Amino acid sequence: GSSGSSGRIVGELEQMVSEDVPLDHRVHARIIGARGKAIRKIMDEFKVDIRFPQSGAPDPNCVTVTGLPENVEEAIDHILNLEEEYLADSGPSSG
């Protein structure tokens, strides 16, 4: 007898909301992974759909994430978290 929804859910497609998360291109691949796995676990985690900016994208530093407004928000916080951690290790290579 819980107030409203009792268990977790995915929601409706239309119900989902597209958001823009400011992600540095220096942490893009690092997050995406090799075959898109590192980003696969994150998506399923919050059940969202992260859409990285393509080469001809207007914002190569912004990623479009789809999904409920309650799940997306959480995903973002997790995204920026990895951004910093990764950045921390950014040194000017010889060439």
Swiss-Prot record:
Occurrences of domain KH (ranges): 24-89
Q: Where in the cell is it found?
A: Cytoplasm; Nucleus
| Superkingdom of source | Eukaryota
Describe its function. Answer: Appears to play a role in cell sterol metabolism. It may function to protect cells from over-accumulation of cholesterol.
This one is known as: Vigilin
Annotated source species: Homo sapiens (Human)
